[PDB]
Paper text:
The family of poly(ADP-ribose) polymerase (PARP) enzymes plays a critical role in the detection and repair of DNA damage. The PARP enzymes share a common catalytic domain, in which an ADP-ribose moiety from NAD+ is transferred onto acceptor nuclear proteins, such as histones and PARP itself. In both PARP1 and PARP2 the DNA-binding domain regulates enzymatic activity as a direct response to DNA damage. Here, we present the structures of the catalytic domain of human PARP1 and PARP2 (catPARP1 and catPARP2) in complex with BMN 673, the most potent PARP inhibitor reported to date.
The crystal structures of catPARP1 bound to BMN 673 were solved and refined to 2.35 Å resolution. BMN 673 binds in the catPARP1 nicotinamide-binding pocket via extensive hydrogen-bonding and π-stacking interactions. The binding interactions of BMN 673 with catPARP1 can be broadly delineated into two parts: (i) conserved interactions formed at the pocket base with the nicotin­amide-like moiety of the inhibitor and (i) unique interactions formed at the outer edges of the pocket with the novel di-branched scaffold of the inhibitor. The core tricyclic group of BMN 673 is tethered to the base of the binding pocket via conserved stacking and hydrogen-bonding interactions. A fluoro-substituted ring of the tricyclic core system is tightly packed against a small pocket formed by Ala898 and Lys903. The intricate network of hydrogen-bonding and π-stacking interactions between BMN 673, the water molecules and the extended binding-pocket residues explains the stereospecific inhibitory activity; BMN 673 is >250-fold more potent in inhibiting PARP1 than its enantiomer. When bound to PARP2, a methyl group of the triazole moiety of BMN 673 points towards Gln332 on the N-terminal helical bundle; in PARP1, the same methyl group faces the highly mobile Glu763, which assumes various side-chain conformations among the noncrystallographic symmetry-related molecules. Also located on the N-terminal helical bundle, the PARP2-specific Ser328 is near the fluorophenyl substituent of BMN 673; in PARP1, the highly flexible Gln759 with multiple side-chain configurations occupies the corresponding position. Interestingly, our crystal structures unexpectedly show intermolecular disulfides formed by Cys845 residues from two different monomers (data not shown). The observed disulfide linkages are most likely to be experimental artifacts resulting from the nonreducing crystallization condition.
Author numbering: 662 to 722, 726 to 744, 748 to 780, 786 to 1010
Write the structure that this text describes.
């Protein structure tokens, strides 16, 4: 029997849920026979990324695109008439599929490679996880952040916080050290599919590989965060059939922000800048900022930023070095769909 709190045990089950892994693969139309969880290979996936990059290029300028489509389906067997990879959104969906596959492989490997099994798998995450007491001020601050920064245009659901966890990944403090005293450190959201979280906890937030198409990345390949909970929660890809999601709060060392109103695929920041801020029309009210253990929490309700000429409804924040993030909390959220 495990010594871990029930909420933590429930999180471990959730994150190592093999059935969720398989359901995801069925929804992607992957052939589970020909490409089982244990068989996923880093080198095949890398080659698949490159083919998707060639596809995107061929689309941007009918026979050759059929052949590339087929080369992709040979590398990543599907179980379908096979849809042509002939537009940016289709390509993007396959890239996101490959990302999700990669983290699923990580989860499956950890799982397969005397004590209660929940405890054995907990240890494999190499992450200290503690429950934040529902009645603490810490929890209250976090619930406020969730409540106040739900955007008015994300009306498909409300959020309810079920559990709040405090997390410390092995090695992250040391890795974050050079950034620990950069100025402008902010507690920001990052949402991702549940089936990615074993990978995220064991390896941290990562940046897309060189081989991946840049298409879809408004500010280039980086790690993206929001100051509005719902903007991030949308990337949980929850649904009525699976309405429980996981979302992170990260301390992000933003330093001097390169403020942008429109897409720009950053390959190198201007010297002296440490992050990108995509400027939204709505921003959390600066007067309501609260410090939490030295870090600003922009938990104000949304007001007008005064920026009209922008591509974005809400802010986003991007860093280009994985060491500029120190993960602090993990929330289990129930999405109540309307
Ligand atoms: C899909 N994805 N994969 C890695 N990162 C993400 C997204 C993202 N994930 N999670 C967040 O919380 C987030 C919060 C934002 F303000 C903005 C975000 C994100 N945009 C990122 C984005 C969107 C489309 C795209 F093609 C590439 C990147």
């Amino acid at each position: 029997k495990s010594k871990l709190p029930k909420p933590v045990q429930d999180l471990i089950k959730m994150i190592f849920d093999v059935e969720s892994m398989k359901k995801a693969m069925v929804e992607y139309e992957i052939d589970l026979q020909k490409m089982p969880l244990g068989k996923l290979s880093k080198r095949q996936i890398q080659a698949a990324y490159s083919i998707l990059s060639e596809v995107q290029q061929a689309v941007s300028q009918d026979s050759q695109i059929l052949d590339l489509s087929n080369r992709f389906y040979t590398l990543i067997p599907h179980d379908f008439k096979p849809p042509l990879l002939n537009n940016a959104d289709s390509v993007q969906a396959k890239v996101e599929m490959l990302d999700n596959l990669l983290d699923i492989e990580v989860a499956y490997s950890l799982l397969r490679g005397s004590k209660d099994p929940i405890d054995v798998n907990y240890e494999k995450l190499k992450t200290d996880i503690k429950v934040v007491d529902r009645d603490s001020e810490e929890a209250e601050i976090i619930r406020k952040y969730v409540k106040n920064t739900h955007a008015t245009t994300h009306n498909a659901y409300d959020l309810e916080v079920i559990d709040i966890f405090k997390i410390e990944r092995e090695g992250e403090c040391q890795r974050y050290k050079p950034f620990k005293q950069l100025h402008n450190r902010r507690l920001l959201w990052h949402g991702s599919r549940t089936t990615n979280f074993a990978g995220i906890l064991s390896q941290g937030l990562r940046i897309a590989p060189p081989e991946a198409p840049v298409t879809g990345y408004m500010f280039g390949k980086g790690i993206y965060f929001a100051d509005m909970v719902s903007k991030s929660a949308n990337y949980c890809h929850t649904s009525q059939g699976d309405p429980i999601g996981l979302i992170l709060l990260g301390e992000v060392a933003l330093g001097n922000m390169y403020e942008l109103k429109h897409a720009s695929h950053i390959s190198k920041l201007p010297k002296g800048k440490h992050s990108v801020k995509g400027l939204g029309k709505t921003t959390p009210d600066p007067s309501a900022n609260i410090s939490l253990d030295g870090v600003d929490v922009p938990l104000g309700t949304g007001i007008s930023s005064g920026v009209n000429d922008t591509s974005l409804l809400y802010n986003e924040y991007i860093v280009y070095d994985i060491a500029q993030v120190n993960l602090k909390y993990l929330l289990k959220l129930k999405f109540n769909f309307k």
